[PDB]
Amino acid sequence: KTVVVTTILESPYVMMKKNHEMLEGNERYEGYCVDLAAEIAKHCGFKYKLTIVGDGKYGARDADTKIWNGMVGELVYGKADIAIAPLTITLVREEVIDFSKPFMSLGISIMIKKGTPIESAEDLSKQTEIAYGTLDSGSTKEFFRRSKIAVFDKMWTYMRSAEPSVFVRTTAEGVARVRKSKGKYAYLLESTMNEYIEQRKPCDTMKVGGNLDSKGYGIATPKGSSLGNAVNLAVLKLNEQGLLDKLKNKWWYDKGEC
């Protein structure tokens, strides 16, 4: 039967085509993950339907109810068969769902509006004129919340209490905030996205400093899924075939407008 793929609208991973209104099904979308999903479905020989996660989140566990939201939740509760998106491989998630070996390597990075007096995380933690935050319900927020290293811990103390809130619902919201904040806001996001945005108009942002950590994105399946094994080998095969690198250049720099 048709495999239900959950994903999220996040450029350049998954975006609606210009003429999506006249298109149907999987044809309505384009992007790195759209291409990746097609490659995987072909090598594993299955039909699939791309669906956009209902709450538009990656996935976090509610501390009160212990209920998972986002794409992780759709997998945990049987609403989806596989997640193909820029979903970060983490311990808390690995405990409830399965991840293939990473199809992309990245790390948390700093996005500033061009000209802002910031070059590192240490620089952000020593000032208060410039606010900074992260995406909600994801791995980046968890990183700071659970960090015991001096600089990041102090950053979390500031962010978790900040008012107004420095957290955002979507990457787009964080990027917009940096751009319209005259440089009084810095956004903490994964290098993959930072590098992508840095190459798009109005070309007013830039990634500064080195990554804060090293991790990766994996294709996720529910625990005990029959697709788990196959997808994992498919990812490795595609990386060694050079496909993943091919797709990276196609959506990041071949389309770059800066």
Next chain:
Amino acid sequence: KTVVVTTILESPYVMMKKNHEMLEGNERYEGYCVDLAAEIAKHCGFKYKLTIVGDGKYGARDADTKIWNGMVGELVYGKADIAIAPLTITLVREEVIDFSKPFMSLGISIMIKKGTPIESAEDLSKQTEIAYGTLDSGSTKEFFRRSKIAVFDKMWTYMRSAEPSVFVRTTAEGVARVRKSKGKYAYLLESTMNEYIEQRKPCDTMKVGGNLDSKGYGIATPKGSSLGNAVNLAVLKLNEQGLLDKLKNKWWYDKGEC
């Protein structure tokens, strides 16, 4: 009871302590993987014995023999319970053994003697005065042998037929060859090793160009091993806590000699 850990003598992952002759068991060794093995064992709750792979190889399957050698072979045939070393996660290997999520991210790179007129793989492929090769029985050689992209295919065509052999039995042998060839030999090895050597006296080598691919190292266990699950969670836990980054700084740069 005691878990047999197979590893390889590869600096700075595993090395004999200066006074190993007067030490016993695991205390005889030191290095990144020795430090990592101790942590993995503590977190998974098991006692272990470090052993150096008999043939000093990482692992490849003999074409006609069909027998796996190196650390992979030790796991495949039941001589070791786990491998903790800079062992690359690859498709052919994941087909016979299990790998944890990566504990280190790296890629194939080029090592030259300082002053060598080479800036990239494309440069090596378009000339013939400078010879170049890779390590034997490993993922790097397999990368070129299977590559379908023009530049690497061209490089493989040359390397596979070059005489005398451009391949080496150990990383140390390749590094020595670069150092003694007066710029007439370039070595293809993983970025991790390239970066390490670049910081070792006589500081006469350097890493040039970007990485050729993107992959990682994983802790390997025999397929279906009962240690697999715990080890994987341990790796994720340790990466998130910053131990892996702390360990790389300790063995790579804190001890740099250049």
